[PDB]
């Protein structure tokens, strides 16, 4: 019969849809998992969707995924109360079976599920407490602590008076009665958390607003024969904006940094005033650009902007990357606009930070000395840079740092003799030719 | 103005001993609505 045939693969595919959704259920995937789950006929696969939750819980690979699982149930209980209505039933009997079985591993699996569901208002506080009365009627203490660690936060909010009575009997356990040792230390840890207020039993996937979960708080008691509806998981036979072309927010910020920068006496004062403002990290690249441009209005290099920039870098590492990003942004882009009076300010400015290791020598590797990838004003910037390296460090100490720098831009060694003839001709034009002793040995071998 | 400036205050007991550096700032001139009045030391290029 083709109708039994059609319904069976329909029953199969629904069963083969729910099981990979539950096996892929995780936090930040809950909403996409629930969406796809909604389009499959949940109501026809009523016990199928329940049993796939129960078995994925029980398996003991999970337990970790229990709050992810319980959050889906509250979504389902919000959407269809009957789904959570049936699913809360099976978890009661699974507890009652394994408590009677004394399967301590499987009990705690169910109890973590029942705890979180109470955290997600699926089930009533009543059904929780009576389990607690049964467990505390025997010892059962390994089970009951994992319950109260996760649920006692919400439970003391809702049912404080009876909950306090649970603690008072629980407190009578430790002090006036003798207990096995390993169990006992776990019991007093609960007391410790109790002063600590439960702040590590109160984190999970509260996706649903308290009015977006339709409040089907199922009031079922673990003393109610619960109809154990395994049968619906069998197969059957249904005969059934304004665009911003202006930057006036930036200009009022660009004025405020300039007014800080002119109202100070020393560079340590202007540095503290810029660190007082607590500038956000997207603007700290722009604050360096206001400092450099205001250093070019000065018409002469100043030690003010150096010791300003030194206290920026040693404060936090995000200022140090901001000067590293600006030194590349100045050399590769901004050299074409700058006059030769402004380039002697910058080369002495960047020459000062490099000679005192506020910027590394590896930032000089970006600069390349060729005929092609060189500017006539860029060679002027290199000239005033190396002079501040010579005057501060000396000619021997600068020789040591350039050998440790292993750069290829200033120093071509692998070949291309027209570039070696270029760089010797450029460095001797600066007035520093003692460093070109390596290249002239490389040049005459090529000849 | 030359006095709307944070004045460096650094540990007068130990500032006579060594050069401490600028560790703290004293306020220079006080006003209800905060104005950062510039000072001419930023406008006069130094001798060096």
């Amino acid at each position: 019969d083709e109708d039994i045939k059609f319904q069976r693969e329909n029953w199969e595919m629904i069963r083969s849809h729910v099981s990979p959704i539950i096996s892929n259920l995780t936090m930040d995937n809950l909403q996409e998992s629930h969406r796809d789950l909604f389009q499959v006929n949940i109501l026809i696969g009523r016990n199928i969707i329940c049993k796939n939750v129960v078995d994925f819980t029980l398996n003991k690979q999970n337990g970790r995924l229990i709050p992810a699982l319980s959050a889906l149930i509250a979504l389902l209980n919000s959407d269809i109360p009957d789904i959570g209505e049936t699913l809360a039933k099976e978890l009661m009997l699974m507890f009652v079976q394994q408590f009677n079985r004394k399967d301590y591993v499987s009990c705690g699996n169910i109890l973590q599920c029942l705890s979180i569901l109470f955290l997600y208002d699926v089930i009533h506080e009543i059904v929780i407490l009576q389990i607690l009365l049964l467990l505390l009627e025997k010892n059962s203490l390994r089970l009951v602590i994992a319950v109260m660690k996760i649920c006692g936060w919400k439970l003391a909010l809702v049912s404080k008076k009876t909950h306090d009575m649970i603690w008072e009997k629980l407190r009578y356990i430790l002090q006036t009665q003798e207990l096995s040792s390993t169990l006992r230390e776990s019991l007093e840890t609960l007391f410790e958390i109790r002063q600590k207020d439960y702040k590590s039993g109160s984190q999970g996937l509260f996706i649903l607003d308290p009015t977006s979960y339709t409040v089907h708080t199922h009031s079922y008691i673990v003393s109610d024969e619960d109809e154990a509806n395994k049968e619906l998981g069998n197969f059957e036979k249904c005969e059934n904006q304004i665009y911003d072309m202006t930057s006036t927010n930036d200009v009022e910020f660009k004025k405020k940094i300039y007014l800080v920068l002119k109202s100070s006496l020393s560079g340590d004062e202007a540095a503290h005033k810029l660190l007082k403002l607590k500038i956000a990290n997207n603007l700290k690249k722009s604050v360096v650009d206001i400092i450099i441009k205001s250093s070019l209005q000065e018409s002469t290099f100043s030690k003010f902007y150096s010791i300003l920039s030194e206290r920026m870098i040693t404060f936090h590492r995000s200022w140090q990357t901001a000067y590293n990003e600006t030194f590349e942004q100045n050399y590769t882009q901004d050299i074409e606009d700058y006059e030769t009076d402004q380039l002697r300010i910058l080369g002495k400015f960047w020459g000062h930070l490099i000679s005192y290791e506020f910027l590394p020598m590896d930032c000089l590797k970006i600069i390349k000395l060729t005929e092609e990838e060189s500017c006539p004003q860029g060679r002027i910037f290199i000239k005033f840079l190396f002079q501040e390296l010579v005057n501060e460090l000396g000619l021997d100490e600068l020789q040591l740092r350039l050998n440790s720098s292993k750069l290829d831009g200033m120093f071509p060694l692998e070949g291309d003799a027209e570039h070696i003839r270029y760089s010797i001709n450029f460095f001797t034009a600066i007035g520093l030719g003692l460093l070109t002793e390596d290249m002239r040995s490389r040049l005459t071998i090529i000849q | 103005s030359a006095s709307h400036i944070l004045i460096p205050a650094s540990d007068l007991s130990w500032s006579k001993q060594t050069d401490t550096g600028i560790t703290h700032f004293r306020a220079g001139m006080t006003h209800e609505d905060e104005k950062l009045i510039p000072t001419i030391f930023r406008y006069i290029t130094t001798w060096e």
Partner: peptide
Amino acid sequence: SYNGIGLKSAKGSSTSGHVQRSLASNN
């Protein structure tokens, strides 16, 4: 707190005596 820094008083100083730590001097 008055950890050796600041003024004996702000009466004859013609300032407020407000001391704030230099965020620039750290290391």
